[PDB]
Amino acid sequence: VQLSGEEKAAVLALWDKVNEEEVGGEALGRLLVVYPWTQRFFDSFGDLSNPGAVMGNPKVKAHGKKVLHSFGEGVHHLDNLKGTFAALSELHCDKLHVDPENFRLLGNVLVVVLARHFGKDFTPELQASYQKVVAGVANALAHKYH
Amino acid sequence: VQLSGEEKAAVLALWDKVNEEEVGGEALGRLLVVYPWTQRFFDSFGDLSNPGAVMGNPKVKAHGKKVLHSFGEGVHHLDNLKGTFAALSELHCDKLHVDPENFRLLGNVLVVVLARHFGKDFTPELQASYQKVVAGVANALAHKYH
Amino acid sequence: LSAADKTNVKAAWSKVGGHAGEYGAEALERMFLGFPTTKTYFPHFDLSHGSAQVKAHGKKVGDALTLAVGHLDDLPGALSNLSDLHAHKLRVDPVNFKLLSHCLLSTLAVHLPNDFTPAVHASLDKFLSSVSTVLTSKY
Amino acid sequence: LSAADKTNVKAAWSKVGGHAGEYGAEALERMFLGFPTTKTYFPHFDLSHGSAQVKAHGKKVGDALTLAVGHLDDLPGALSNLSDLHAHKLRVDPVNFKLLSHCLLSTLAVHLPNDFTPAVHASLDKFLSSVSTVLTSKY
Numbered sequence: 230v231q232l233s234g235e236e237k238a239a240v241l242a243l244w245d246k247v248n249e250e251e252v253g254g255e256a257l258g259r260l261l262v263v264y265p266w267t268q269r270f271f272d273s274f275g276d277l278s279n280p281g282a283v284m285g286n287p288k289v290k291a292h293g294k295k296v297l298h299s300f301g302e303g304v305h306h307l308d309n310l311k312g313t314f315a316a317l318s319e320l321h322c323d324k325l326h327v328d329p330e331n332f333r334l335l336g337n338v339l340v341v342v343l344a345r346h347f348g349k350d351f352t353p354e355l356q357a358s359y360q361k362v363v364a365g366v367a368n369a370l371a372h373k374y375h
Numbered sequence: 376v377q378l379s380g381e382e383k384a385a386v387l388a389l390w391d392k393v394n395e396e397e398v399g400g401e402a403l404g405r406l407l408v409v410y411p412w413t414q415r416f417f418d419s420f421g422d423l424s425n426p427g428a429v430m431g432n433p434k435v436k437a438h439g440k441k442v443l444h445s446f447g448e449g450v451h452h453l454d455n456l457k458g459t460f461a462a463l464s465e466l467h468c469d470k471l472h473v474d475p476e477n478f479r480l481l482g483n484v485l486v487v488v489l490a491r492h493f494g495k496d497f498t499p500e501l502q503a504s505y506q507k508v509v510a511g512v513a514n515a516l517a518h519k520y521h
Numbered sequence: 522l523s524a525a526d527k528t529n530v531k532a533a534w535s536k537v538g539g540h541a542g543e544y545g546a547e548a549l550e551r552m553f554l555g556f557p558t559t560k561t562y563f564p565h566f567d568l569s570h571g572s573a574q575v576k577a578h579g580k581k582v583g584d585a586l587t588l589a590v591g592h593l594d595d596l597p598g599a600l601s602n603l604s605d606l607h608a609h610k611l612r613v614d615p616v617n618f619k620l621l622s623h624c625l626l627s628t629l630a631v632h633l634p635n636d637f638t639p640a641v642h643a644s645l646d647k648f649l650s651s652v653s654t655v656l657t658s659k660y
Numbered sequence: 661l662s663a664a665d666k667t668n669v670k671a672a673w674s675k676v677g678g679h680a681g682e683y684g685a686e687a688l689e690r691m692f693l694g695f696p697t698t699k700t701y702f703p704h705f706d707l708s709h710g711s712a713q714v715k716a717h718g719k720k721v722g723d724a725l726t727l728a729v730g731h732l733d734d735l736p737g738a739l740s741n742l743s744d745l746h747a748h749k750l751r752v753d754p755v756n757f758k759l760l761s762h763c764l765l766s767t768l769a770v771h772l773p774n775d776f777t778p779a780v781h782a783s784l785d786k787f788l789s790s791v792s793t794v795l796t797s798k799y
């Protein structure tokens with residue numbers, strides 16, 4: 230990913246402050262509420278009818294934590310994104326059949342959730358760097374669809 | 376691009392029958408008529424107000440021929456798409472600032488124009504292979520946006 | 522849609538005539554082969570070439586499009602039943618409506634090459650986007 | 661938009677209050693930095709941080725959003741002037757309306773974290789998509 234050396238340091242320093250469970254649970258829940266067709270993939274998780282049931286569903290929280298942990302792996306391996314997510318790309322293409330447009334949607338919801346948690350510390354410049362990161366991850370996850 | 380050996384041969388055999396000037400002129404013209412915000416990039420070419428002025432504009436025909444010729448280069452280099460279009464990706468990102476969603480739009484218009492020219496010979500299976508080709512080209516052209 | 526679009530769409534669909542079901546089936550087939558992710562909505566279908574389920578479903582799709590062309594001034598009313606089905610029950614990802622639209626245009630180009638002029642393509646594209654918007658309107 | 665959406669959007673915008681112009685300017689800045697292709701529509705602007713042109717344009721954007729929230733039942737009428745500008749004169753690529761919407765939501769999250777609940781985010785997303793649709797409706 231085209232990221233300067235000052236940019237990477239700011240990205241890594243913010244990740245130190247990311248609670249993967251809180252952020253991850255909130256980002257996956259907001260995806261399910263805002264883009265409700267994504268609920269189709271998670272029928273396993275039970276009741277996802279109203280926002281209250283989504284945000285407090287323990288499986289939404291646990292899965293969001295797993296998603297965010299894997300995001301954090303990408304953040305710590307920005308020079309090898311395609312290889313970090315190769316196995317996950319196969320899983321999402323071949324087993325789950327997620328359209329890759331949804332990877333971009335989740336990445337943008339994550340950015341909005343980072344904004345909500347960090348406030349004015351989440352500057353326009355730091356958002357810009359995170360937009361490059363989430364796009365890099367979405368394209369690594371789409372690699373094996375191609 | 377994930378293409379079988381039988382698939383590549385069918386793709387190449389159709390390209391033998393492609394008139395780059397006729398197909399290219401029609402595909403670029405249809406892009407400009409159907410997705411009229413794309414006209415913004417081609418003010419150089421003059422009058423693009425109504426469909427009649429677009430389809431008969433000689434610069435639309437000449438540019439569409441150039442675009443299709445470069446497509447044909449991709450078709451003949453399907454194992455090295457990123458390298459065939461590297462210089463063009465730089466040009467479209469850095470100099471012209473074309474959003475890459477428009478590469479996908481042009482690729483789909485090209486497929487519709489192939490369908491119109493070849494009729495029943497443009498089978499569901501041959502279209503499927505061309506969809507892989509045009510997506511591979513659109514992603515090679517988007518390479519240096521990332 | 523503009524009044525010129527409406528006129529083009531009604532004109533173009535009168536040339537489709539009774540082949541709407543056959544074109545709807547071919548469009549589905551083109552979509553399943555070109556865009557294999559779409560097959561996951563049809564676990565209960567035989568997706569074989571010439572499958573009678575695809576042929577029957579293509580007829581339902583073509584009939585709904587013909588109904589829409591007769592109700593261009595009130596698509597949400599004419600299609601409300603289908604909006605609930607695709608958004609609430611089926612939860613179809615909106616991206617797939619773009620894919621089917623493209624496959625339908627490809628099918629019309631194949632069979633009506635002299636009628637599929639640039640102006641008619643542009644009006645049909647707008648019609649199919651307008652149908653798609655209605656069908657994804659319940660989310 | 662549903663009636664529940666309308667209620668959420670009117671409620672959420674009353675919490676924005678008089679900061680609509682400042683949020684519109686910040687959203688533009690976030691967009692120009694995150695999505696540099698959008699800068700090509702503003703050759704005549706100083707895109708510096710704190711530029712008065714961006715601040716002034718952010719005020720026009722925030723005012724138009726406030727106008728839209730007062731006219732949720734007739735957005736095409738209330739925004740028709742802006743539809744002609746963005747589609748016919750400026751020819752803004754529709755993708756850029758998604759980018760600005762995302763940047764505006766990001767800005768609201770920053771400044772109103774306790775009010776930016778999942779239900780309010782979902783209603784604002786629908787509102788911004790509905791505004792965007794109107795503004796790209798003339799093609």
Ligand code: HEM
Nearest residue numbers: 267270271273295296299300325327331332335336367370
């Ligand atoms: C874009 C960033 C994404 C990342 C980093 C990511 C990551 C992951 C990870 C790490 C797993 C764990 C699989 C395992 O434990 O073996 C997983 C599974 C899964 N993901 Fe994703 N994912 C992303 C996007 C999406 C999206 C957008 C959807 C659907 C809208 C989705 C649907 C699923 C499903 C259904 C599973 C399996 C859940 C289960 O086994 O119960 N993912 N993903």
Ligand code: HEM
Nearest residue numbers: 413416417419441442445446471473477478481482513516
């Ligand atoms: C997706 C497949 C595409 C291919 C293979 C392609 C290819 C080309 C080629 C070969 C050139 C020649 C530049 C030169 O002669 O040095 C070019 C220039 C150009 N392209 Fe593309 N292009 C694609 C898509 C697009 C799209 C979608 C747009 C805008 C909507 C666009 C806008 C332009 C412009 C404005 C120029 C410069 C024209 C001029 O110098 O007068 N291209 N492109």
Ligand code: HEM
Nearest residue numbers: 559562563581582585586603607611613617618621652653
């Ligand atoms: C122009 C766009 C579309 C139209 C006019 C349309 C129309 C219809 C109609 C008329 C029905 C059957 C209603 C009934 O028998 O009760 C139906 C069902 C269905 N549609 Fe759509 N459809 C469209 C797009 C899509 C897309 C893009 C998908 C998914 C890729 C999809 C998936 C389904 C499925 C799974 C069913 C149920 C089929 C069954 O269970 O027999 N549809 N649609």
Ligand code: HEM
Nearest residue numbers: 698701702720721724725742746750752756757760791792
């Ligand atoms: C919520 C979406 C948007 C709204 C409410 C909005 C609103 C406005 C308003 C109120 C004006 C000024 C009208 C006037 O002074 O006559 C304007 C102008 C303009 N907008 Fe938009 N806009 C939106 C999206 C966009 C986007 C996405 C772009 C391009 C990336 C864009 C580019 C422009 C430009 C270039 C101008 C002319 C500015 C000038 O020359 O001073 N707008 N918009």
